[PDB]
RNA sequence: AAGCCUGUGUACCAGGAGGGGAACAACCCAGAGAUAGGUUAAGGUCCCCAAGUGUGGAUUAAGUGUAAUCCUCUGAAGGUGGUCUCGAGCCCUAGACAGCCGGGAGGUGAGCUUAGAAGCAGCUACCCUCUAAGAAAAGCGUAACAGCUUACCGGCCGAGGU
RNA sequence: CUGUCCCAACGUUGGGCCCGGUGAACUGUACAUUCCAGUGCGGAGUCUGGAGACACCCAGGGGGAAGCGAAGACCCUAUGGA
RNA sequence: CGAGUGGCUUGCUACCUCGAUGUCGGUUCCCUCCAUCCUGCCCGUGCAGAAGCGGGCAAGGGUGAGGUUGUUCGCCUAUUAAAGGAGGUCGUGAGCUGGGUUUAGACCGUCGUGAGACAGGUCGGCUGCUAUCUACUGGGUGUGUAGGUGUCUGACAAGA
RNA sequence: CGCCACACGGGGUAAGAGCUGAACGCAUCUAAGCUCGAAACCCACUUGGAAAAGAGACACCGCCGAGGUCCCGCGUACAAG
């Protein structure tokens, strides 16, 4: 199913699990990556991937983008490189599909998506000055898998 | 901007409209230098290329006009010469100058002679397996040389195996 | 064969549309106009796109027909017709009191209308009407 | 192919039944296709003297029957024109079975052959008893 | 899926209407190469026979062997270039400037023209020479007419008039050449322009067939099988799709067929002679007996017997000329039988 | 999703002229007795077509564009040393950036591993001389050498460069 | 077995075409020489923009007039019928 | 995983027509689109050659004949340079055909107490009209240019 | 169903191959310029075409007579015309 079907925020918030059953599990494997035993403050460089447009990102997209980003960090810094990446959003919004025609149209439950407002941090990675260009590359690959245009922003980091 | 090119003692350069002619002991070359708001003129002993605009596109042509003129200075004095070597593996390639065009026979065993016409007052001299393309107009000479190499072009088969042809050996 | 033109316009190095616009206005005011040196008239832009537009007009047509001129003669004449209500009495009279010529069949040199002249020293992206006709397949009779 | 040296009005079509002028054991042949031929909408693919055609065996020995082989048209009832203007026509329509190299599959040829076929298929000719 | 198929007939010979002139009009002429000379000639179609020839083609396996060839006999008596017309180059193409006429006229030219009684050849000539000095002189052509009276088999005496271009060396030389021919009496023959073995382009108005249907006129199919018995036999399926809501001129329809001008290219001139060598026993059916200047054209020629046909040196030959072919035999066998 | 279905508030069409919008129920101006003069609104002032080929300045080279709104006027993620403008850091006449010329040296072919490995298979170390430079060698190359260049220093050049 | 087909041709008879005589019907809101696009209740000769277009008449095969012919026999609706 | 283009399929909607815009498939005849099957010109190759594979430009021309099936589609055969796809009221019934869907007769299976039914199968089962306008193919008569004969020019138009 | 005839070549381009060449001292097929390069485009060739409203040109004949129509005998033409 194309994202065109779910990317917009044209529907009421639909997250109350006490009134919604049969919700598919999330495909997102992890939210905390790298060295989760270490603190973010232990790093000189902090780069975030910022969403430029308000949208809904299906859990399948979060996984694909997160995967393609962390997979790169692993390939360039090693399975235990000195870095830590975070996917701060969780797919709370439940999605439907009307899969009879328009009669009794209320859709059956098909998935979940995360609502992200423009200007927000979807991903935030923490690394050393050396690995700064590696995290910028992970993010480049990550924004190619989500609907909106993004900004790769260096927050804590002035070895520039 | 403005750039001044002091013409060599050996040379004398005349100019009318958008055309510039450069004459030397080795010949004469006339060229059209036409571009928006770029004035080329002969101020006694120097050629002047100037313009009231300084945008990227204008600067590009100004620098281009300079080298064009400088190349003309060199062409009417020292001249331009391209060196070429005719190489073949199985079939003896016959390269001859006939009229105003260089002809190549028996290329890769071909019955039909490959040929190309020489540009301008360009001279092609052959001494065995060596060729020398020369003249005062770098444009004409450069093309004549290139055309000769392009004349033995092969697309049908693997060039790494079928390397026959005339190639540019020395470039001025 | 003789045309008592009250005004003789020289189109050499002039922007066809700007000339046409003025020639249309004058013809509607009662003036008999003669456009001279049409082959040397000019239109600004990228030659490749300009040519495509005119080639398309040649190709267009059917049984009812779409006769589009190839010679710089007609191109200019047609350009003027588009600035006149040629189907109305007043429009047709004005149009018929206007004639375009290849070169200058008159003794007098034409006058250059204000704001129509193109400076070749300041422009490189433009085309000659004659060049367009040659590309269209016209017989260079000028 | 090489010029026949004669103009031919194809007298056969896809589906025609013709005589197998050899001793291969095949008596009757059914035309299926004509080598190198391309027709036009609704046109029955045509074959005539000198053409190499694909064929199936309709009559003959059990082993030869139903086989799909190649053959060469040796004789045809419809006339053909020779350079001198004269027309030449045969008593029947006949073809000789041939292999990949255009060599007759059989040992002997039955009945006459047209001289024009000889030009194109040498080994077929050098097996002919009569050449008219 | 509805197999593809080329459309019925060519769209390049239209509109398929009755020709305006029964006398053909070449719309193209040969290029200027050799010496100055008239670029065409005319004759009257007589009929057909065959000839045995010696294979001329150097690339033919049959080179030197006997070969039967179809031939159309055309009576080609001498014609008369009665005037020299001059064209001037103008911004609107070529326009006739003036003409230089003669005094010697065929006894029956007045059956078609209002023959000149008073004319100033030199004034016209002067005007042409001044035009040439100015460099405004376009090509040069000769007003020519036939002498049907010389051809007994043709009922007409009224001459056929046509203009033929003169191509040659310099314009000055060919201008002089033109004037010379005209001044004499304009009398010229097939020999003067053509040589047996050369290729010529023959123009002519085809045999008329009046109104004919799409099957004959355009080559469309006849209704097939069961369809052929329903009430429709030689009518096309439809005049077009729903849209466009109009009948396109490209759909094959009924109309005038035949009596059109055609210019058949590359016709080999087998022989140019005089006498009765080519005449058939009993006479050419619907024509008569040939005994005079003739031309044997290879193959067929557009038009019916008696019609005026035009010759012109091939403007786009494929093969090189193989002059004076050896004619070993010309059939005189009756065409009746 | 719909020129979709179904609410709600409001104005309009329906039942609303006239001006504009190419045409066009509901978009803009505008609510209108007749007649007459005048001034504006929306919108527009190169011609078609009433009014500017108006003024100061800048951008665009694609005919982009000359398309408020819209079933109607598309154009996206992604990309761009196309071009214009503005800012920050660093280097530079003690000569920067680039290019061209010259030098790119010895202990020593480091030790180990290995038949061999000598900058460059792998492991480890990565030391000091001459000097204005020159790695226990950044990239090709060899069976291994050779060979070719990067770093590094000098010259030529001369103005911004990154 | 053969023109059903390849692939169509020629011919025969009656029409067709022209002339004398006889002499209807269907159909008709108006206007109407249209074509390409657009627009419009979304399938326009007639609106908009262009293009083309001198008038009348003869023959033709039927592309369009969502052609003529029949208050849809499908479907639904009616507090209809049989 | 993300962004799109098309409007050939299917679905959705119920805007248009129920005082009717004649169905499917086929046929015949015309025009077109390009997302190119062949052909031309090219680039790359895991390009020696030969034979290929993939890609670019490109719509000029070509893309055919048969066996089963009403079939569209599709399966299969032999040929072929290749035997491309799609739009034109799913082009084309005032052109044809009428094999299928879908009238009235009948049989079988299933369902039903039954009349009778079936998004099951099967045999049989009709194709109206003299063209007013417009459109085009061809043929005339007039008028305009403003007496005649003959010969030409070439704005444009068509072609594969 | 038989027979005859139906190019080549130019010009300008696409994709592409290159030349000279700067912005950016180098490099660079491109930004200005240029050499090439498709069955495609233009020309060539065939057909139509003075109603092209800028409604054409030339020569001769003629305006009391040139020419044309009707008529008659016929077809290389044709449904009327
Ligand atoms: Cl047209
Ligand atoms: Cl108007
Ligand atoms: Cl410019
Ligand atoms: Cl076949
Ligand atoms: Cl049929
Ligand atoms: Cl009110
Ligand atoms: Cl434009
Ligand atoms: K209905
Ligand atoms: Mg190969
Ligand atoms: Mg068929
Ligand atoms: Mg019937
Ligand atoms: Mg006979
Ligand atoms: Mg006989
Ligand atoms: Mg109401
Ligand atoms: Mg005004
Ligand atoms: Mg645009
Ligand atoms: Mg908008
Ligand atoms: Mg209109
Ligand atoms: Mg009803
Ligand atoms: Mg019912
Ligand atoms: Mg009841
Ligand atoms: Mg209908
Ligand atoms: Mg394409
Ligand atoms: Mg086409
Ligand atoms: Mg249909
Ligand atoms: Mg179709
Ligand atoms: Mg119909
Ligand atoms: Mg019907
Ligand atoms: Mg009917
Ligand atoms: Mg049926
Ligand atoms: Mg049945
Ligand atoms: Mg049935
Ligand atoms: Mg009038
Ligand atoms: Na339901
Ligand atoms: Na994105
Ligand atoms: Na312009
Ligand atoms: Na046109
Ligand atoms: Na019937
Ligand atoms: Na019948
Ligand atoms: Na219909
Ligand atoms: Na109201
Ligand atoms: Na309006
Ligand atoms: Na535009
Ligand atoms: Na029959
Ligand atoms: Na109709
Ligand atoms: Na109705
Ligand atoms: Na059908
Ligand atoms: Na094509
Ligand atoms: Na089938
Ligand atoms: Na329909
Ligand atoms: Na049908
Ligand atoms: Na019917
Ligand atoms: Na070309
Ligand atoms: Na006229």
């Amino acid at each position: 199913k194309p994202a065109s079907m779910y990317r917009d925020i044209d529907k009421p918030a639909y997250t109350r699990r006490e009134y919604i059953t049969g919700i598919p599990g999330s495909k997102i494997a992890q939210h905390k990556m790298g060295r989760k035993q270490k603190d973010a403050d232990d790093y000189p460089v902090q780069i975030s991937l910022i969403v430029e447009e308000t949208v809904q990102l299906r859990h399948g997209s979060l996984e694909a983008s997160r995967l393609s980003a962390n997979r790169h960090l692993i390939k360039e810094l090693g399975e235990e490189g000195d870095y830590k990446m975070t996917l701060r959003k969780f797919p709370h919004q439940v999605l439907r599909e009307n899969k009879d025609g328009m009669r009794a149209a209320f859709g059956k439950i098909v998935g979940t998506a995360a609502r992200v407002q423009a200007g927000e941090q979807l991903f935030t990675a923490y690394c050393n000055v050396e690995d700064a260009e590696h995290v910028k590359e992970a993010f480049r690959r990550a924004y190619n898998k989500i609907t909106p245009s993004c900004r790769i922003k260096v927050e804590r980091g002035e070895e520039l | 901007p403005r750039v001044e090119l002091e013409i060599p003692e050996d040379v004398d350069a005349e100019q009318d409209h958008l055309d510039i002619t450069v004459e030397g002991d080795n010949g004469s070359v006339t060229r059209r230098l036409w571009y928006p708001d770029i004035d080329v003129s002969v101020d006694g002993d120097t050629v002047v290329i100037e313009s009231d605009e300084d945008n990227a596109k204008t600067m590009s042509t100004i620098g281009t006009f300079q080298s064009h003129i400088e190349n003309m200075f060199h062409g009417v004095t020292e001249g331009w010469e391209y060196g070429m070597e005719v190489f073949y593996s199985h079939f003896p390639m016959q390269v001859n100058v006939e009229g105003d065009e260089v002809v190549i026979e028996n290329f890769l065993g071909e019955k039909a002679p490959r040929r190309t016409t020489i540009h301008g007052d360009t001279d092609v001299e052959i001494d065995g397996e060596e060729l020398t393309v020369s003249g005062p107009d770098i444009e004409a000479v450069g093309q004549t040389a290139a055309d000769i190499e392009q004349l033995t072009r092969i697309n049908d088969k693997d060039v790494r195996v079928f390397q026959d042809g005339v190639y540019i050996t020395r470039k001025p | 064969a003789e045309f008592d033109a009250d005004v003789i316009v020289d189109a050499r190095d002039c922007i066809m549309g700007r000339v046409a616009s003025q020639v249309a206005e004058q013809a509607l005011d009662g003036e008999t106009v003669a456009v001279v040196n049409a082959e040397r008239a000019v239109i600004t832009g990228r030659e490749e796109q300009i040519v495509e537009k005119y080639e398309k007009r040649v190709d267009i047509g059917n049984d009812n027909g779409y006769f589009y001129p190839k010679r710089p003669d007609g191109i200019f004449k047609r350009t003027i017709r588009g600035m006149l209500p040629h189907k109305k009495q007043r429009g047709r009279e004005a149009f018929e009191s206007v004639r375009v010529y290849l070169g200058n069949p008159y003794d007098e040199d034409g006058e250059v209308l204000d704001g129509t002249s193109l400076d070749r020293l300041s422009n490189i992206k433009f085309v000659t009407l004659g060049e367009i006709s040659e590309t269209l397949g016209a017989n260079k009779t000028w | 192919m090489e010029a026949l040296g004669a103009d031919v009005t194809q007298g056969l079509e896809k589906g025609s039944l013709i005589t197998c002028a050899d001793n291969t054991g095949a008596r009757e042949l059914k035309v299926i296709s004509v080598h190198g031929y391309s027709g036009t909408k609704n046109r029955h693919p045509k074959a005539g003297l000198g053409d190499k055609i694909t064929v199936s065996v309709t009559k003959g020995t059990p082993e030869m029957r139903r086989q799909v082989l190649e053959a060469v048209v040796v004789r045809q009832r419809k006339p053909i024109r020779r350079p001198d203007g004269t027309r030449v026509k045969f008593e029947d329509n006949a073809a000789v079975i041939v292999d990949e190299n255009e060599d007759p599959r059989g040992t002997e040829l039955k009945g006459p052959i047209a001289r024009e076929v000889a030009q194109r298929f040498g080994s077929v000719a050098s097996a002919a008893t009569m050449i008219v | 899926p509805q197999p593809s198929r080329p459309r019925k007939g060519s769209l390049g010979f239209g509109p398929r209407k009755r020709s305006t002139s029964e006398t053909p009009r070449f719309n193209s002429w040969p290029s200027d190469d050799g010496q100055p000379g008239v670029q065409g000639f005319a004759g009257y179609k007589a009929g057909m026979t065959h000839v045995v020839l010696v294979n001329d083609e150097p690339n033919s396996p049959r080179e030197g062997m006997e070969e039967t060839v179809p031939v159309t006999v055309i009576e080609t008596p001498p014609m008369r270039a009665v005037a020299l017309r001059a064209y001037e180059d103008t911004p609107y193409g070529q326009r006739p400037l003036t003409e230089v006429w003669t005094d010697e006229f065929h006894s029956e030219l007045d059956r078609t023209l209002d023959v000149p009684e008073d004319h100033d050849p030199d004034a016209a000539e002067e005007q042409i020479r001044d035009a040439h000095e100015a460099g405004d002189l376009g090509d040069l052509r000769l007003i020519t007419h036939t002498v049907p009276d010389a051809v007994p088999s043709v009922p007409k005496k009224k001459p056929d008039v046509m203009e033929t271009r003169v191509g040659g060396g310099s314009v000055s030389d060919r201008l002089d050449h033109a004037l010379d021919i005209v001044e004499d009496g304009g009398e010229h023959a097939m020999n003067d322009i053509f040589r047996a073995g050369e290729y010529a382009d023959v123009a002519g108005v085809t045999k008329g067939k009046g109104t004919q249907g799409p099957v004959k006129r355009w080559g469309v199919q006849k209704r097939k099988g069961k369809h052929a018995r329903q009430g429709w036999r030689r009518r096309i399926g439809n005049l077009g799709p729903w849209n466009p809501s109009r009948v396109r001129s490209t759909v094959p329809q009924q109309g005038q067929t035949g009596y059109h001008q055609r210019t058949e290219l590359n016709k080999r001139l087998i022989d140019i002679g005089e006498g009765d060598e080519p005449t058939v026993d009993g006479g050419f059916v619907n024509y008569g007996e040939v005994d005079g200047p003739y031309t044997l054209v290879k193959g067929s020629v557009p038009g019916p017997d008696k019609r005026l046909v035009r010759f012109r040196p091939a403007v786009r030959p494929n093969d090189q000329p193989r002059l004076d072919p050896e004619v070993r035999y010309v059939s005189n066998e009756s065409n009746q039988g």
Side-chain angles (χ1 to χ4, degrees), chain D residues 5 40-42 81 83-85, chain E residues 3-6 62 67-68 221:
Chain D
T40 190
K41 185 187 177 186
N42 301 324
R81 183 174 59 82
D84 80 315
Chain E
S4 289
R5 162 222 55 161
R62 295 186 51 73
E67 211 164 75
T68 297
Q221 303 190 345

Side-chain angles (χ1 to χ4, degrees), chain B residues 20-160:
Chain B
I20 312 169
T21 312
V22 176
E23 299 176 65
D25 288 329
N26 189 44
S28 62
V29 181
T30 306
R31 293 202 59 184
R32 190 168 189 214
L33 294 194
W34 184 32
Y35 196 90
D37 306 306
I38 294 185
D39 294 302
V40 181
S41 58
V42 186
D43 190 24
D45 65 312
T46 65
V47 176
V48 181
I49 301 173
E50 62 191 321
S51 182
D52 289 318
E53 287 191 293
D54 61 321
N55 59 43
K57 293 188 178 184
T58 294
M59 302 312 280
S60 298
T61 306
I62 281 175
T64 288
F65 283 178
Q66 182 178 307
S67 295
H68 278 343
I69 299 170
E70 292 180 326
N71 279 6
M72 296 189 269
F73 285 168
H74 189 95
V76 299
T77 62
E78 289 188 56
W80 297 105
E81 296 190 314
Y82 285 75
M84 302 187 292
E85 282 200 76
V86 37
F87 168 72
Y88 69 81
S89 59
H90 185 95
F91 293 97
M93 202 185 309
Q94 299 172 59
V95 185
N96 286 88
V97 197
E98 305 175 351
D100 292 300
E101 58 180 64
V102 25
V103 183
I104 298 182
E105 298 177 292
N106 200 228
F107 181 69
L108 263 60
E110 281 179 24
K111 289 190 175 188
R114 292 192 181 203
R115 43 180 54 196
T116 177
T117 303
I118 301 173
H119 290 100
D121 301 317
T122 297
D123 307 289
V124 182
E125 292 189 302
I126 174 181
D127 192 276
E129 306 304 275
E130 290 183 58
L131 281 171
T132 173
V133 190
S134 54
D137 183 355
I138 187 170
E139 287 274 286
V141 185
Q143 260 304 328
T144 308
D147 291 327
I148 290 175
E149 187 182 299
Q150 292 292 100
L151 194 60
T152 56
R153 176 183 172 180
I154 172 174
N155 311 311
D156 45 281
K157 302 177 291 281
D158 195 330
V159 183
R160 302 169 304 187

Side-chain angles (χ1 to χ4, degrees), chain E residues 42-60:
Chain E
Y44 293 95
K45 185 177 174 173
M48 291 191 79
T49 15
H50 55 296
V51 57
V52 178
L53 255 37
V54 173
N55 197 304
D56 225 298
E57 203 165 64
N59 299 296
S60 170

Side-chain angles (χ1 to χ4, degrees), chain E residues 110-132:
Chain E
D110 61 314
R111 285 177 172 263
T112 311
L113 322 166
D114 284 324
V115 191
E117 293 187 74
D118 289 296
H119 178 54
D120 194 330
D122 303 280
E125 182 179 331
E126 185 185 303
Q127 181 162 44
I128 297 176
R129 313 207 89 120
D130 283 334
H132 179 27

